[PDB]
Structure formats: C-alpha cells, structure tokens
Amino acid sequence: ETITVPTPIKQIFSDDAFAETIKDNLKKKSVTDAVTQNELNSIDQIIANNSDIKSVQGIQYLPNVTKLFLNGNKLTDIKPLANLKNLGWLFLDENKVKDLSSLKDLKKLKSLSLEHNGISDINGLVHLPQLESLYLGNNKITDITVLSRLTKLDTLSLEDNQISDIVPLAGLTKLQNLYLSKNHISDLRALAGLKNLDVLELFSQECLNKPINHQSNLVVPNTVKNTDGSLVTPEIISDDGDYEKPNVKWHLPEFTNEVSFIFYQPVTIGKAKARFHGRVTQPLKEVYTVSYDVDGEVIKTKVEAGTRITAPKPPTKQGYVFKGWYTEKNGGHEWNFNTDYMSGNDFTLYAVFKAET
Numbered sequence: 001e002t003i004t005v006p007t008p009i010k011q012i013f014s015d016d017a018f019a020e021t022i023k024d025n026l027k028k029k030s031v032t033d034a035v036t037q038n039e040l041n042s043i044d045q046i047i048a049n050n051s052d053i054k055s056v057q058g059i060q061y062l063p064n065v066t067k068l069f070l071n072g073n074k075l076t077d078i079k080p081l082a083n084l085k086n087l088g089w090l091f092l093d094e095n096k097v098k099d100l101s102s103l104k105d106l107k108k109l110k111s112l113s114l115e116h117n118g119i120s121d122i123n124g125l126v127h128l129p130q131l132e133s134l135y136l137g138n139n140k141i142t143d144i145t146v147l148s149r150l151t152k153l154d155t156l157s158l159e160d161n162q163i164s165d166i167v168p169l170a171g172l173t174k175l176q177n178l179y180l181s182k183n184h185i186s187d188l189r190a191l192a193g194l195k196n197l198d199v200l201e202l203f204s205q206e207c208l209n210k211p212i213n214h215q216s217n218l219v220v221p222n223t224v225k226n227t228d229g230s231l232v233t234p235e236i237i238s239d240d241g242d243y244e245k246p247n248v249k250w251h252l253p254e255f256t257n258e259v260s261f262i263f264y265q266p267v268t269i270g271k272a273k274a275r276f277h278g279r280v281t282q283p284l285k286e287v288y289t290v291s292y293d294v295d296g297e298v299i300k301t302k303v304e305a306g307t308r309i310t311a312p313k314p315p316t317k318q319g320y321v322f323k324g325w326y327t328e329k330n331g332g333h334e335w336n337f338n339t340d341y342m343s344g345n346d347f348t349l350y351a352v353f354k355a356e357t
C-alpha cells in the first residue's frame with residue numbers, strides 16, 4: 001500500500017474518472033504524470049461529486065485523507081477505503097453501496113452519509129460507536145436496532161425509509177437534529193426523553209395494519225400515540241366513520257376492501273417543535289360463512305370470498321363411510337375443494353354417507 005518509484009497516476013487509480021480526480025487534486029497536467037508517495041501523502045481532502053466514478057481502487061495509497069466527498073457516482077465496493085485510518089468525513093449519497101463491512105476499522109469516522117443507496121441492513125454500523133452525524137435518508141431500512149449502540153450521535157436522518165419501531169432511539173439523549181418524516185411511525189413514546197432536541201421532523205407517516213374481516217359494524221382501535229402515550233384524535237375518517245374513544249367505528253352494510261383515517265398532532269419535545277401527521281390504513285377481507293351440515297347438526301366456518309376452501313377433517317359415522325360434501329341434502333353435486341372457490345354468499349354443504357358392506 002505504498003509506492004517506491006515515481007508512478008503514473010493512471011497506473012495507480014484504474015478508474016479513468018478517479019484518475020482525473022487525483023490529477024486535478026495534485027494540480028498535475030496529465031494522468032500520465034508520474035507521482036511520488038510524498039505527493040500522495042499530502043492529500044487531505046478529495047472532492048469528487050457527480051464525476052461518474054465507478055471504483056476508487058488506488059485510494060489505499062492515500063494514508064492521510066480525512067474527508068472524502070463522493071456523492072453522485074456509481075460506486076458499489078468501498079473495500080479500498082478500509083484502511084484509511086484517519087478518515088473523518090465520508091459522503092456517499094446516490095451510489096449503490098450496501099456492503100458496509102469495509103467501514104469496520106474506520107475508528108475516526110465522525111460523519112457518515114449514505115442517502116439513496118438502496119440500503120436495508122445497517123448492522124455493520126455497530127463498529128462505528130464514535131459516530132456523531134449519520135444520514136440514511138431515502139433507503140429501505142426497517143430495523144434500526146443497531147442504532148442504540150451509537151450514543152454519540154447528535155445529528156441523525158432516517159427520513160423516507162420503512163421504520164415503525166423507533167424504540168432503539170430512546171436512549172440517544174445527545175440527539176439534537178432528528179429527521180423521521182416519511183416512515184411507518186405511529187407511536188412517539190420512544191422520543192419522550194430526548195430533552196436536547198432542537199430540530200425534529202415527523203411529517204407524513206404511512207401506517208399499515210394487518211388485514212381483518214369486513215363487518216357491517218366495524219370497530220378498530222386507534223393506535224396513534226403521543227410522547228406521553230395518550231391517543232391522538234383522528235383528523236378525518238374514511239367511509240363516514242366516527243371516533244368513539246379509544247376506537248374508530250364504521251357502518252359498512254356493503255363490502256369495501258379498505259377503511260382508513262388521517263391524524264395530525266403538534267408535538268413539542270424539549271425545545272423542538274414538530275408536526276406529527278399521517279394515515280392509518282386498514283385492509284378488509286370479504287368473508288361469508290360455510291355451514292357444514294352433518295345429519296342436521298351444523299358447524300360454521302368463515303371463508304374469504306374467492307379463495308379455496310380447505311376441507312375439514314372428515315366426519316366419522318360408525319357403520320358408514322364418508323363420501324363427501326354436497327350442495328344439497330339429497331342430490332346436488334359434490335363440492336370440489338380445488339376448483340370450486342368460495343361463493344360471494346353464505347351457503348351450506350351436506351355430508352353424505354354410504355352404509356358399510
């Protein structure tokens with residue numbers, strides 16, 4: 001990771017664009033110019049945004065770089081950065097960097113930016129406990145459990161991800177600038193003890209419930225919670241519904257496959273003011289009842305319209321053998337549990353038996 005003879009830039013830095021970057025950094029005339037290790041040692045800062053760089057191979061010969069600005073390139077592999085022990089600032093917005101193992105030994109890194117890299121797994125960040133400023137906006141993150149180890153963070157952006165569980169932030173009391181817009185957040189309790197916040201953003205949450213059965217008289221708990229745990233009153237409710245604290249209630253004589261409600265809550269934590277607003281979406285399934293009739297005695301099972309019915313364990317009537325489920329007590333036809341899908345209405349199936357030889 002050192003050169004011992006004057007060596008052309010183009011031989012050290014194999015990516016054409018990055019070689020030109022080094023050339024301009026050292027104020028050389030040409031990527032053909034030979035440079036010494038002492039010149040390479042002099043590089044403290046590289047600014048090469050939007051420069052169509054595909055690889056930084058060769059950067060490992062720059063032991064003293066402390067700030068690296070590489071936003072808007074085509075990087076995937078940052079392995080050549082792994083031994084830049086003095087790296088302090090590292091900006092890699094708008095690349096496709098996902099393997100963060102190569103950051104493991106950058107123990108002086110204090111500011112990291114990786115926005116719009118398509119990242120989901122940030123567990124690699126546990127090796128950067130000294131980190132102070134972290135920007136991860138516009139990624140695909142759902143699990144921020146690792147961040148509870150990053151107790152020196154005072155500036156943190158997680159906006160435009162898919163986060164619902166912010167409890168791992170609860171202990172990060174040094175936090176002063178916190179960006180959480182455009183996630184899946186419905187419960188602010190984790191933020192309650194962040195007494196040092198100055199900037200806080202909580203706009204535009206989308207909160208998706210697991211599906212439940214549609215019903216004429218539908219009741220859904222309000223799950224939107226303030227920093228003190230109190231429920232946030234809905235701002236407006238779909239499908240003519242009403243709020244009956246703590247529940248949202250609808251009258252739905254006709255099936256619809258979704259109801260929803262919108263919420264808005266001004267929030268103050270320490271010195272920071274924010275506006276927590278968003279939408280709770282509730283998918284509904286259209287269900288009807290299959291009555292299984294065994295010689296007049298009935299068991300009722302709910303089934304979603306248009307799906308296959310899973311046949312039950314068959315009845316055993318001693319002295320007889322079960323022959324199947326039919327659409328009429330006598331006659332009709334046999335239900336085919338593979339090709340007959342659930343009707344859009346209640347109906348009955350009748351067990352048919354044949355006496356034993």
Ligand SMILES: [K+]
Nearest residue numbers: 238239258259
């Ligand atoms: K609706």
